Amino acid sequence: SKARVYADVNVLRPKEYWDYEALTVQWGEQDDYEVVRKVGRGKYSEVFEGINVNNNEKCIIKILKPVKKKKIKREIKILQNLCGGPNIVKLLDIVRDQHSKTPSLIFEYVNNTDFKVLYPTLTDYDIRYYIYELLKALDYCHSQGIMHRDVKPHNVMIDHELRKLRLIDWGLAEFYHPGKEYNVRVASRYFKGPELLVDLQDYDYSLDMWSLGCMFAGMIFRKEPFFYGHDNHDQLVKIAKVLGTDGLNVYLNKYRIELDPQLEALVGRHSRKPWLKFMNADNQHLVSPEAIDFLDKLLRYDHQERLTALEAMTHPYFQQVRAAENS
């Protein structure tokens, strides 16, 4: 398998663009940044609102938990390469503690609202608008030879008062090289594409479009998360019960993949459910043939058949967002 767009971005660029192991980190001054309050945490970092003591401007300080040199360089290089792109979080400095060597990444501040409380209040137009803004970020990173590989609501910061969005946490992101076999232990379970779940390692930017489609399904159907598996096997089952097993077998045969027999046994046999099986009273104002059409074109087993992010931006579901942007 090869990406159908942007396959040659790293082939054409200087080796230094993508050879992140050759990066020499240029450390700033740790005392320029002071922690104000904790705002997030995860397996690989704790996140704080901070202040730059020189100019009294807010920032975000991401303090990294113990990590290999290779992995920190990958995230720094990808952030450096993407800084300035539409709706991409901006890495401003990189510092570390002298005694422990604990590194902190310093970002422009973003004033986010908890998605679990925000999404119930978004109107149909707001869903179209924020998904468009997220697609700007995905088409940009893909155009720069990068897959994010962890798109989920937790990594999409939205300041709803200011209608501003940033795609954050580039810690799982990778450069795309044609034919490379990648680790499938990426993304959050509920957003993992079928490629990860069936061990197709030569995947590409289209992985991010499956994760996007799971986010979008969750928003328009008001079902968080949309595919609610308890482990990676159960995740494929939850997908197969919606998309049907016929499509799955076609996919598996095309890429000459066989399922582990236990996984095969769990998946069983399922007809394709129609997307309208999911509409109900709470979500009804958000669900339309344009939304379903757009969703159906993202949630395909075959990663080669999904819309690209640039194709998604042009889908008529977004016509009003485009028209508004034009003036």
Ligand SMILES: O=C(O)Cn1cnc2c(Br)c(Br)c(Br)c(Br)c21
């Ligand atoms: O995980 C990350 O990269 C950083 N991270 C975690 N929670 C984060 C929040 Br809340 C904001 Br606002 C920003 Br900006 C980043 Br950057 C965050």
